[PDB]
């Protein structure tokens, strides 16, 4: 026997919980420090968390976890090299951190140690950028840059205390504004290289690599992108994708132009129904039984009809599917023979699974069993969603495959077209208006997306409810109320979200609205500010406009000049109060709108997320305009 | 709305089992998949059951070959054969 | 069957010669070509067939029919430029509701031929808001200082606490033109806005994203309201002669 | 991408035209519409152009 044992998210032994990985305390302290930064003290905590007790043991734990996840191990020589680099960094950081804590230390000595540490980090960084092993080192790299980006940050805050002149502080601000972009570019380079390479052989391997990066890489990139401020909230909304089925090669231009769009579906709607096209046949005698998954159809909004079949919903060749007012549910043909008795069955049915009473599935059990027969691969399938057994295999017992993650819930169920070209309808597959479907004879795969629990409230109330206790709120762009036409979904995982909106409408206007509600006890007199993250490659003469619409009490909050820049930019509005907007605890049609005029042919612009933070809690510490 | 119906498609009498002179009067075909004598066996019955769903009445389509051998006393003495007609929109259905 | 569209022979009959059937009307042009489902029940997907978002189709084995719609020539400019161009010489402008730039979801088409149009918009959205926008452009020589007024024809059977709102949106220069109390009345009503000028709206001869918006809040289950058409007339040329409130 | 192909499906030799002893070796079927001897004629060729 090869393996009769159960599986856990396709792995032979249970995986570590997403909140119990080795980089979790680092991320937690980073999120804590983003809200309130303890000057000349945060670098010490980051050093104690990355190198506990001046030991590289936590980094080795991270390396082992990543190697276990992505099925790529390193050689002992590379391990020794990385450990030597760790030891050098640890020596220099020990010198610096020890000299800091002496009451009455010399500022010039601290300046020298700071310069030595920054130089050593910059010098040893390229050791983690060898592409031949990047798929692993991209994790370790992510930590090192952090240790650097923290250091410089602290150096900018503690000015003359560490022996820095004003020119030194300005040079450090310039170096920080340069490195916060260079490190992100290099990280994205490694990620895109390895992701495309792994997708060109099988979509499952690329999905696994992406799931690893969503936990060990991208949250820290977002943290970097939020370190220049003080008061915003560090929150990730990336999803984990479980793939069960055969291997399908996918190009990188085909991932962001079709496959990801088919996986996401209605990006702001809750899954309400899922349908499968099941086929079973044991026609001959020497040829064993077999099963096929012909198509998957997810139904989110029952009144929109945007999502279509991924695969096919056909059940016969008699062109009878919607006639007589009913829907064909199952077609079974039983054949009997006679030789001087073994009835054969051919079944083609449509399995339907509606959403549970609690609106969402918590876990699943989906598995496929392969069988070789004269260089021909036959399949058997087992499907169970939550507590409803959807399909038990007729070809024999199949071991389970527990698909679950503590702190996540099932939000989307889709598939990938198998045996067809994935290069068509790229420019047609938009967010709305168009039909989201793709014809294919079979799929033979099921893809389940788990979303974190911080998104469970939006997909249940269709709005964003504000509380008084919290100080900062992050709103992803994909969690909108309505969006304009000719809008696309752009996978931007470095933003710690499931994607961004690409506006490319050449008529009327490009507008995106978000629904806001207020809980009881909310203080309507407290001052707030809005921060909008956008990317405007082409110049827009009318700029970007942030507006508040409340039952006709439309008020203009901000008008920002849209200049050409290929990098992400944050627009900050002036202060305001919820009494100026006319919003109370009973307002149900309150909306925030981000709008711009029509574009030209070949032009587009990107919207990432929104930040709502109180005025007292928000402060810019490192100016971005000083390059 | 269209009621049930039955059809007699062919009759095949077999006298001398080793001569093979008599053939089908009508047709012995049971499907359009060209499968009748493959795999060494003879197709005896093909049943298709269709299920629908409207916000349950399974339909059946049966095509089989009924076989009756000669009795122990070599000959049949009597029989009971009958057909029932039914009109439906100028269409005659049979049982 | 014999089919010919304009000058392109689409299908000549193989079963023999068929006499012609000249489909033409002086002053009209072909705008829509459709058919009717034959041999199937026509009672399904009524609540699903909306103006947008949904798929506009119906499965049927055959149709055996072709239906051609001729529209008058006064609509030829809109279906060619996707906007309404305003001139200085004319004093009054009528804009049907179906000639919009964009419309909200859960909106239906209501055949109201007594309004001398091809139909009216029925809003029945129970979330966000019900909004309808119309694109306006100005020809050269248009006087931007002349005063104008807006008249909105609506039918509001159920009470709307927030009422109806007419607004002018021009590249962010959004200005509120009118806020009208929506009381329950099963008959058609005209709301007249206050006077305004195109300089107050910031619209010139080069504005390409100028829009007029008619909006209202979300409705309740089983509620809807109808919009028929819009009237743009100069202030000097408009006068109410028979008061409608004196019943 | 799949090149052209040809198949020999059946051979039928006819010796004595009035005996009918020899039959098809293979198959004489040409379609799945069960039309071969209807209308008094014999189906000679079925061509489908796509």
Residue numbers in the entry:
A (entry chain A): 13 to 352, 357 to 643
B (entry chain A): 298 to 352, 357 to 396
C (entry chain A): 397 to 643
D (entry chain A): 298 to 347
Give the text the authors published on this PDB structure.
Cry11Aa and Cry11Ba are the two most potent toxins produced by mosquitocidal Bacillus thuringiensis subsp. israelensis and jegathesan, respectively. Cyt1Aa, Cry11Aa, and co-crystallized Cry4Aa and Cry4Ba. These are produced during sporulation and are remarkably stable in a variety of conditions, but dissolve after ingestion under the high alkaline pH levels characteristic of the larval mosquito midgut. Solubilized protoxins are activated by insect gut proteases enabling binding to gut cell membranes, subsequent oligomerization, and ultimately gut cell lysis leading to larval death. Cry11Aa and Cry11Ba structures maintain the three-domain organization characteristic of Cry δ-endotoxins.
Next, we challenged the role of the dimerization interface (interface #1) by mutating a residue positioned in the central part of the interface, viz. Y449 in Cry11Aa, corresponding to Y453 in Cry11Ba. Y449 is not involved in direct H-bonding to other protein residues but supports a large H-bond network that interconnects waters and residues from facing monomers in the dimer. Furthermore, the two facing Y449 engage in edge-to-edge aromatic-dimer36 interactions (centers of the rings are 5.5 Å apart, and the angle between them is 88°). The Y449F mutation only had a minor effect on Cry11Aa crystal dissolution, indicating that deprotonation of its hydroxyl does not play a major role in the dissolution mechanism. Nonetheless, the mutation was detrimental to the protein stability and resulted in the growth of crystals of different size and shape, likely owing to destabilization of the H-bond network at the dimer interface. To evaluate the significance of these changes, we characterized the distribution in size of crystals of Cry11Aa-WT, Y449F, F17Y and E583Q using AFM. All three mutants had a significantly reduced volume compared to WT Cry11Aa, due to a reduced thickness of the crystals. The structures of the other three mutants were determined, using the WT structure as a molecular replacement model for the phasing of diffraction data. We found that neither overall packing, tertiary structure nor interface formation is affected in the tested mutants at neutral pH.
